[PDB]
C-alpha cells in the first residue's frame, strides 16, 4: 500500500534527478564547445 507508493515516489525522484544530471552534463559539453570556439576566435585575433 503506502510502501509501494514510497518506492514509486523515490524511483520517480531518482530518475528525474539522473535525467537532470545528464542534461546538465550535455549543457556543460555545449558550454565548453562554445568556450573553445570563442578561445579559437580570440587566438585568431591575436
Amino acid at each position: 500500500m503506502v510502501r509501494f507508493i514510497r518506492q514509486e515516489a523515490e524511483e520517480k525522484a531518482n530518475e528525474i534527478s539522473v535525467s537532470a544530471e545528464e542534461e546538465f552534463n550535455i549543457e556543460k559539453l555545449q558550454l565548453v564547445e562554445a568556450e573553445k570556439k570563442k578561445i579559437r576566435q580570440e587566438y585568431e585575433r591575436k
Binding site: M1, V2, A9
Partner: protein, 114 residues
C-alpha cells in the same frame, strides 16, 4: 478535529495523500465500503461519526442523521471520485484544518457564529 487523532492513528496503523474532510451520513456506511472500491482500494483509512446529534444541513436548519467524517484520499486522481462520493453523501460537509487544535478552534468559531 476528532479524526485528527483517530483517522491519523488509523492511517499510521494502515501505512502523499489527499484530505477527504467533509461528511458522510449514518446511512453512508455502505457507500463508503461497498462503493468507491476502485478509488479507496482498501488502503485508505477513515474516521466517521454515527450522527450522535442531528446536524443541520448547510442550507437548512431542519437537520438529519448527517454524520460528519474525515478520510484520506489516494491521490488527486482518486480524490476526484472521492469528492463525487462525498457530494453523493450530502451531509453537513466542510473542510477543516489538519491540526487538531486548529480544527477545534474553527469548529468553535463556526458554532459561535451559528
Amino acid at each position: 478535529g476528532e479524526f485528527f487523532s483517530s483517522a491519523l492513528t488509523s492511517a499510521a496503523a494502515q501505512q502523499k495523500l489527499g484530505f477527504i474532510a467533509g461528511l458522510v451520513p449514518r446511512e453512508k456506511s455502505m457507500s463508503f465500503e461497498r462503493m468507491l472500491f476502485r478509488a479507496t482500494r482498501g488502503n485508505v483509512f477513515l474516521r466517521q461519526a454515527v450522527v450522535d446529534e442531528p446536524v443541520v444541513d448547510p442550507v437548512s436548519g431542519e437537520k438529519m442523521e448527517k454524520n460528519v467524517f474525515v478520510v484520506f484520499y489516494s491521490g488527486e486522481r482518486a480524490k476526484n471520485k472521492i469528492l463525487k462520493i462525498c457530494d453523493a453523501f450530502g451531509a453537513n460537509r466542510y473542510p477543516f484544518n489538519e491540526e487538531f487544535d486548529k480544527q477545534a478552534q474553527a469548529i468553535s468559531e463556526v458554532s459561535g457564529r451559528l
